[PDB]
């Protein structure tokens, strides 16, 4: 619904200061764990 | 135009090795033996 009446003329003001504006963000990470064991045993025994 | 660029980066590395080993030997009238023991350790890292 028009809520006001339709005017003759319209208060305007010009700005043509056009902006163009990019930002990236990238991020990385990484984390590598590693662990390792080992465990040995040798036995002998001997008689003639 | 106004461009504006920054990059950071951090590597981390780690190592820790540890190796033990035992060993044991006797013999009387011939009554020989032995014995040997080991153990390991290798944990790494790398954070990037």
């Known amino acids: 619904r028009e809520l006001i009446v339709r005017p003759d003329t319209l208060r305007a003001i010009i700005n043509n200061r056009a902006t163009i ?5 990238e991020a990385e990470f990484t984390e590598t764990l590693m662990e390792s064991n080992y465990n040995s045993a040798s036995v002998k025994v001997s008689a003639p | ?20 080993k035992a060993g044991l030997e006797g013999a009387v009238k011939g009554w020989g033996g032995g014995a040997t023991a080991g153990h390991g350790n290798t944990q790494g890292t790398i954070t990037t």
């Not at chain 1, 504006?21 to 963000?25: D, S």
């Not at chain 2, 135009?1 to 190796?19: C, G, L, P, Y």
């Open chain 1, 21 to 25: 504006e990019t930002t990236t963000m």
């Open chain 2, 1 to 20: 135009a106004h461009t504006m660029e920054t990059f950071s980066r951090s590597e981390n590395e780690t190592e820790v090795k540890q190796d033990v």
